[PDB]
Design a protein around this nucleic acid. Structure first.
Length: 108
DNA sequence: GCCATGGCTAGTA
DNA sequence: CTACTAGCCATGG
């Protein structure tokens, strides 16, 4: 399998998500049959124009937190998205937006 | 050829 | 609970 097909598969998947629930970079590389490519899933999302109707925000690291993404402050748009999604979000000791991971994982 | 990034994971201290 | 490991891997200079 080449890239770009890859990219799409992902995108389609991240639309397969149910409003409210979420998944995980790894939990998606694993799925589109490309287990190891978790890190590329981040990038895939990193790309994306702001004009999209794709559910970027509702996706996280296996830690069940908003990944750092060092270069950004959309970490907030991601937050202010799901407290909008009804998903309850709790800020954390020395920073961090975390939340009950397994209330919201996704299943066929 | 190289390394330096990256929205990563899964260990084990 | 945190911190710091291995490994993983495009992508671009």
């Amino acid at each position: 399998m080449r890239m770009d097909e890859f990219y799409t598969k992902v995108y389609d998947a991240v639309c397969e998500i149910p409003y409210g629930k979420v998944s995980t970079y790894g939990e998606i590389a694993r799925y589109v049959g490309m287990p190891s490519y978790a890190r590329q899933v981040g990038q895939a999302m990193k790309h994306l124009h702001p004009e999209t109707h794709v559910p970027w925000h509702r996706v996280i690291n296996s830690r069940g937190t908003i990944s750092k993404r060092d270069i950004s402050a959309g970490e907030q748009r991601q937050k202010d998205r799901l407290e909008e999604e009804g998903v309850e979000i709790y800020q954390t000791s020395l920073g961090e937006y975390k939340l009950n991971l397994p209330e919201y994982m996704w299943k066929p």
